[model samples]
Target: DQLETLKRIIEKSEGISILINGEDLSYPREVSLELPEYVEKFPPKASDVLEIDPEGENIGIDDIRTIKDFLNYSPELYTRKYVIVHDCERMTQQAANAFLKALEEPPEYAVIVLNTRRWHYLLPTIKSRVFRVVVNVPKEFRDLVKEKIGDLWEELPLLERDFKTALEAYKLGAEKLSGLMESLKVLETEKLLKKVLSKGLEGYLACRELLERFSKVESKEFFALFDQVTNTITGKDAFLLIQRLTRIILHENTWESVEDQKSVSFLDSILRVKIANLNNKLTLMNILAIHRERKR
Candidate 1:
């Protein structure tokens, strides 16, 4: 039904504005990957498309100037041109207005796609002009997790009560994990202690995986992983893992002194927060980034 809806949009519309509204951040990329397949005669290659991304920078009037130029150019090698504007919410107010004007009369051969996680940020005028596609967690998400991780899928509901469950849930998929987290009722602090405990090694391995993949992971993946890890792991277990991982990395010379200390102290602060009844994932990601930077 998702693909069918996308196909219908592609077949009928010249300009499409897709709002991926769910907590699962990964669905937008999945949807983006599936799109070129429906475009007749278009080879599935990066060269065949144009992408506008703000990355960490602000999308401003100058970026809109480039977009105007991008739209004016006709497709050279392909019959149809595809332009994807990623993180449409990042666009400045002036840029949004400029984009809306462009959307009103996009090129005949160009299929303009405005990909955004939050559609509310976009101007109403822009929303009214284009066909909107809403993407939620994929229907096959649970089945896919079961297929990939086997019995681990059954443990997910139970695991949600633990902060450690976040890392495992992220491994399944972030978007799915987001939805799960939203509906999840975390165990009370008193009951949290009574929950069965897995070996500390599991937490260490998850942390290791996070460190290794942090550099290569995309923004959405990082957000999803961070969201799950900080939310699900037990406060005590989180502190233990941080301490253990820091010692291992230091003794192994896995990172330079400055970077290693930075990573350890960063995680230590997050652990400190958990002690105060406030847990934050941002610190976890910050340490992961430090690890990644050291590796680089």
Candidate 2:
């Protein structure tokens, strides 16, 4: 559906600027690859397309100025000029401001595509002038997780709930022994804590321990340590936790054999979580489960 929708948009618009936002960092590139098939005047070969890197350390006024100059010119061979800017949000304030006028009114034969993971950082004026497309993690992605992870997928939903329990316990002054005893009833009922005590919190503790040691450390001591660590975490700390876990999963080298690259793609999708969506925990568990699967 995303591909079809994107095809339609390209067919109807010319000399227009588009903003593609999504959890999949590669969606913009995927769309760009399919453009020529839909647009009559688009160049047939990939080399003819212009891809810009806005995140380079050397990128500044000169880089943006060169882009503006390029936009002003006509295409060499193709009837239309296509430009794709990856991670457009990384553009510095000065560069973004300078690029605004050109974004507002590009040459008639040019089309500009801006791709970003953080939509809120874009300038409001720039956002208003472009067509916005939001791509979500498709159901096929979830199905792949389920297939690779099996029954372990059920544990994914409990991640956020456990984190919330720890946050509440922290607020109730439950860091000490006496305070923790007072909140024992509330803590005992949490699925993650209960599983940690019974099933040894293998998944949760395993991830936290691996991140800490930067290697494998499978010990029962980290079971309670996990709870202590989570207790110190505030709302903002949850995002950082997710990011850290994602980094560990990617670096573990467990996903190297998956032919379709689904494992890595799923991990990247999990890393993109900003707000607490319903799918967050499930996606997190998917990464953890895939790692466990590979180990087996």
Candidate 3:
């Protein structure tokens, strides 16, 4: 979630601080909204932003004092405070305990919002206290993501079957080897095309041309090409692939110019074509590589 809904609430509300799990919501508002005006005024300002960006100075779950300091100083001047926390599930035991106290007796004019992709992973007691908002990934995007990755649920089983098929084919004719190699290249290219689509084709054709070249090359050159390709594609899994692509697509609310939009739409169509070509002759490695590379 981009925290758009949460932002709307903060923007609309005038008073009452929110307790997001245990931390104050004021921090997320400050950082995410980039309110230099509000930050300059500090405790005197109303509706300050707060995000649990560990990158910020004096910001951490353990820094309960930061929250207390703001509240104690700002007091009557501030109308509303906004706090946003990311990776809420990763909160330390001590931090979580400190938060539990706030939940029981939340501060005046404060609102806390906790953002996490894995709500189930949080403690049941923690879950009980907060007014949880479930941010769901839209189904259309999810389906598109699944298709881009090429049916891994079914492919894993087929991988086992194909290994046997390849082994038998290798015994008969090396021509089957060439076909399998080409299939693998196509699989690899498809995944990259999807990535180009997801990334809005900022450099889509440049990537596609490289992929096309890699796919048509001889078997002797396959391993080297595979290595070059996997430089962008390797060291990822299905879950990560979907999560990344989904974020990229969602985050890209709009392109800055007409040319940018055209690039994205063109690559999007190209990825669809590439995804359609995946099949049994494709190696598991190629499939996995393609699935992982779309983000790069």
Which number leads on lDDT? 2
List residue ranges in candidate 2 displaced over 4 A.
32-47, 54-59, 141-246, 249-296
Deviation of model 3 at 121, angstroms: 2.0
What TM-score does prediction 1 earn? 0.52
lDDT for position 204 in model 3: 25
RMSD of 1: 15.4
lDDT of candidate 1 over 74-123, digit per residue (tens): 66676556777776778778887877767777776667666666767777
Enumerate clash totals for all models, in the order shown.
7, 0, 24
- Candidate 2 C-alpha lDDT tens digits along 120-148: 88878768777888866566655554454
In candidate 1, which residue ranges exceed 4 Å CA deviation? 14-21, 45-47, 152-296
Write candidate 3's Cα lDDT for 25-66 as tens digits. Answer: 222322333332243344433436455656422234666545
- CA-lDDT, candidates in order: 0.56, 0.57, 0.44
**Whose TM-score is higher: candidate 1's or candidate 2's?**
1
Note the residue pairs that clash in candidate 1: 24-175, 162-232, 163-232, 163-233, 164-232, 164-233, 166-228
As for lDDT, the candidate ahead, 1 or 3, is 1
Question: Which candidate should be chosen as best, given TM-score against the real structure?
Answer: 1
Q: Provide C-alpha RMSD values for all models, in order.
A: 15.4, 17.0, 17.7
